[PDB]
Amino acid sequence: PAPQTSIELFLIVDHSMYAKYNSNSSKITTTLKARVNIMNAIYSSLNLVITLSGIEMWSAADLITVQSSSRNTLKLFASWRETDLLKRTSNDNAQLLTATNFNGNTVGLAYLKTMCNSKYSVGLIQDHSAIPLLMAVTMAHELGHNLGMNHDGAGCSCATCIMAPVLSSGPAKSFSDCSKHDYQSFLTIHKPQCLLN
Ligand SMILES: [Zn+2]
């Protein structure tokens, strides 16, 4: 919550989310930009700047098989980011934005404490809500996982903070004191270098 850091985030729109907005790049771009602007506000307290390295859209076909099983898709996506994306665009983290309905209760997924990692700095997000604050909180939540944050346990003194385990319809734009600690722990214990520049 103190070293001035920066995440160059890259967004990937899959073919199902492309078709859901009637194959229109402008609607998708503006939709995604509003949500990202909200993410920035959420993160300025941690002194962390989010920058969009770009937005890629799989307009013709999906570059990976997007499965309803979140687990598989996250792994398929991270691998594709390693071997393909990173050769074309430089980014500290990429987040797939899909219209596929993941199996079960899940609306997003990320790897814990992997920010900057060439193989694992990724997240998955289901376009499950039309309310931009809800989507921005979903995006901020998975990014929070890559940055080392766990979910807020009842013994965290917050049920509507960003890292709450399930989405609240009237969320706070705040990180609990547990989330701040996980983050300090990630900074000191993991020493993510890419974020400090
Ligand atoms: Zn979570």
Swiss-Prot record:
Compartment list: Secreted
Domain Peptidase M12B: 9-179
Reported tissue expression: Expressed by the venom gland.
Active site: 142
Domain of life: Eukaryota
Binding positions (Zn(2+)): 141, 145
Family under the similarity heading: Belongs to the venom metalloproteinase (M12B) family. P-I subfamily.
Quaternary structure, from the entry: Monomer.
Biological role stated in the UniProt entry: This protein is an alkaline zinc metalloprotease from snake venom that possesses weak hemorrhagic activity.
The protein's name: Snake venom metalloproteinase aculysin-1
Organism: Deinagkistrodon acutus
Full protein stretch here: 201 to 372 of 417
